[PDB]
């Protein structure tokens, strides 16, 4: 396709408080995402308190990047990203700012899945055995492990689609696990495609992740 | 044994017959992983005996490790799968054994309290497993790599160990398993394969109770210990 593609990178949770390999975590993420030339614009969703750090980080980069303030939930912040998208935007990729190890290949794979799908997510087969349990803390059943996947990021969507879904989401009293669950809640015929992710594509939040992350770079 | 559980004799089977003690020795904080585990289990006085299931190649180092312990602790050789190893452990239990707890030798961080909680659940249940609510969001997907559905997140758990069972029951289930062509994810799934109406009780586990197998896990375990 020749469509305009937007990337929204969220850093509006705990924000920048984090640095691994002598680089702020968001910068590593930013580095990787800025090399994906298929992506026409990058929108950072940030905490207002980190505005100065962010402005500074963005000086290092040329090309189409800008930021907007996040909000009080994950979904409210994403929607702030969505409203900020270029009017030309036809496809949107989303990615956690605190997942710095997503390879360029993974962003590319997520994007290429948009050729024939309107919704795409990344996920990996769970290495830990899952059980579904009941409300009395007894096992209900053990799902087939070959079909149990843990989601990560990036995700990507037809921009008009997910925007309309987000608008319906905010008019509702529904709670969702992630954006792709919206296609279930709002009875969609649109199938959500899964792209195999990377086991090294971890979230870096705790103090130990940082240590682990410093070691991973060294290997 | 435990007074609240009819004074029934309790056995523990610790499996260390995977890659076993070596991977280069599996060490964390300056101590062999199996030693940290065995240290914890041997402090649980409710457990009447401890059976280690080992690789034959690790026997000499196993003996050296076991000298430090006074208790009713011994070892048998394991086999070629987790399950066949567990069965060697089950065959070696004291004739008086009425309850059996199993635990992975490479899960060194399970607290003593977690073992006690697992044992106390045997008071009213014949099967007990430890598990933790999944912090990562799970999807069930299909053969064409599309999302089938997102399970209700409050009911999605990742299992760990210990697990524990009525001894005759788990032994009988094991004989059925051996005579079958089923493959199980863990021992408690035996209850589903053989149509048991005895329910498997879930005890909240510990997020810190990780398995140590890869070089990554060791890095992670050390960062946890230095925290
Ligand atoms: Cl479905
Ligand atoms: Na049930």
Cα(B149) to ligand 1 centroid in Å equals 5
Which residues does A130 contact at the CB level (< 8 Å), separation at least 6? A142, A143, A145, A148, B134, B138, B156, B157, B158, B159
- For residue B131, the cross-strand partners are B159, B204
* Distance to chain B for A68, nearest Cα, Å: 27
Q: Measured between alpha carbons, how far is A148 from A128 in angstroms, rounded to an integer?
A: 10
Q: Are B104 and B15 in contact (CB under 8 A)?
A: yes
* Distance to chain B for A194, nearest Cα, Å: 5
* Distance to chain B for A73, nearest Cα, Å: 17
Closest Cβ opposite residue B200 in set A139, A147, A216 = A139
Ligand in closest contact with the CA of A191: 1
Tokens of A213: 């992350």
Q: Is A149–B138 a contact, with Cβ atoms under 8 angstroms apart?
A: yes
Q: For A191, name the nearest residue in chain B, comparing CA atoms only.
A: B146
Q: Could you tell me if A113 lies within 8 Å of chain B, comparing CB atoms? A: no
Q: Is B139–A145 a contact, with Cβ atoms under 8 angstroms apart?
A: no
B46 to each of B53, B89, B110, B113, B160, how far by Cα in Å?
Answer: 20, 19, 16, 12, 21
Backbone phi and psi for residue B35, each to the nearest 5 degrees, phi listed first: -65, -40
User: Distance between alpha carbon B82 and the CA centroid of its chain, in Å?
Assistant: 11
Q: Is A126–B141 a contact, with Cβ atoms under 8 angstroms apart?
A: no
Q: In terms of C-beta distances under 8 Å and separation of at least 24 residues, what long-range contacts does B22-27 make, across chains too?
A: B22/B57, B22/B58, B23/B213, B23/B215, B26/B106, B26/B212, B26/B218, B27/B218
Q: Is A177–B137 a contact, with Cβ atoms under 8 angstroms apart?
A: yes
Give A67: exposed, middle or buried? Use CB within 10 Å, 0-12, 13-18, 19+.
buried
Q: Measured between alpha carbons, how far is A71 from A89 in angstroms, rounded to an integer?
A: 22
Closest Cβ opposite residue B202 in set A121, A138, A151 = A138
The DSSP H or E segment spanning A156 is strand A148-158
Cα(A138) to ligand 1 centroid in Å equals 24
Which residues does A91 contact at the CB level (< 8 Å), separation at least 6? A1, A3, A4, A5, A6, A111, A114, A156, A157, A158, A159
Tokens of B74: 């011994």
* Distance to chain B for A202, nearest Cα, Å: 11
Q: Which resolution in angstroms does this entry have?
A: 2.0
* Distance to chain A for B4, nearest Cα, Å: 21
Q: Could you tell me if B113 lies within 8 Å of chain A, comparing CB atoms? A: no
Ligand in closest contact with the CA of B148: 1
Continuous H helices in chain A: 25-35, 51-59, 74-84, 104-112, 159-170, 182-185, 207-218
Q: Strands A139-141 and A41-46: what pairing? A: unpaired
* Distance to chain A for B17, nearest Cα, Å: 19
Residue B222 CA neighbour count, 13 Å, CB half: 17
Q: Could you tell me if A218 lies within 8 Å of chain B, comparing CB atoms? A: no
Closest Cβ opposite residue B158 in set A129, A140, A194 = A129
Residue to test with chain B: of A119, A130, A204, A214, most B Cβ within 10 A: A130
Q: For A120, name the nearest residue in chain B, comparing CA atoms only.
A: B146
Q: Are B209 and A160 in contact (CB under 8 A)?
A: no
Q: Could you tell me if A124 lies within 8 Å of chain B, comparing CB atoms? A: no
Closest Cβ opposite residue A193 in set B140, B145, B227 = B145
The DSSP H or E segment spanning A14 is none
Q: Which residues surround ligand 1, an ion (CB under 5 A)?
A: B 148-149
Q: Is A149–B155 a contact, with Cβ atoms under 8 angstroms apart?
A: no
User: Distance between alpha carbon B162 and the CA centroid of its chain, in Å?
Assistant: 4
User: A 163-202 residues with CB below 8 A of B?
Assistant: 177-178, 180-181, 183-184, 191-196
Can you list the domains of chain B with their CATH numbers? 1-227 (3.90.550.10)
Cα(A140) to ligand 2 centroid in Å equals 4
Ligand in closest contact with the CA of B192: 2
Tokens of A44: 């950072």
Q: Strands B9-16 and B97-104: what pairing? A: parallel
């Amino acid at each position: 396709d020749g469509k305009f593609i937007s990337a929204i990178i969220t850093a509006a949770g705990s924000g920048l408080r984090i640095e691994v390999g002598g680089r702020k975590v968001l910068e590593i993420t930013l580095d990787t995402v800025s090399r994906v030339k298929e992506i026409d614009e990058i929108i950072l969703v940030i905490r207002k308190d980190d505005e100065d750090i962010i402005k500074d980080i963005l000086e290092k980069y040329d090309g189409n990047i800008r930021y907007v303030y996040g909000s009080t939930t994950r979904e409210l912040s994403t929607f702030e990203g969505l409203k900020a998208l270029d009017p030309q935007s036809e496809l949107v990729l989303t990615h956690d700012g605190v997942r710095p190890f997503a390879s360029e290949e993974l962003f590319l794979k997520t994007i290429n899945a948009l050729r024939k799908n309107k919704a795409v997510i990344t996920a990996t087969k769970s290495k830990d055995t899952v059980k579904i349990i009941d409300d009395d803390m007894y096992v209900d059943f053990t799902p087939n492990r070959d079909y149990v996947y843990n989601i990560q990021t990036p995700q990507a969507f037809d921009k008009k689609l997910i925007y309309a879904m987000y608008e319906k989401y905010l008019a509702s009293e529904f709670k969702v696990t992630d954006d792709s669950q919206l296609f279930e809640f709002f009875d969609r015929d649109e199938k959500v495609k899964v792209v195999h992710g990377e086991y090294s594509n971890i979230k870096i939040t705790t103090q130990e992740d940082i240590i682990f992350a410093n070691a991973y770079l060294q290997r």
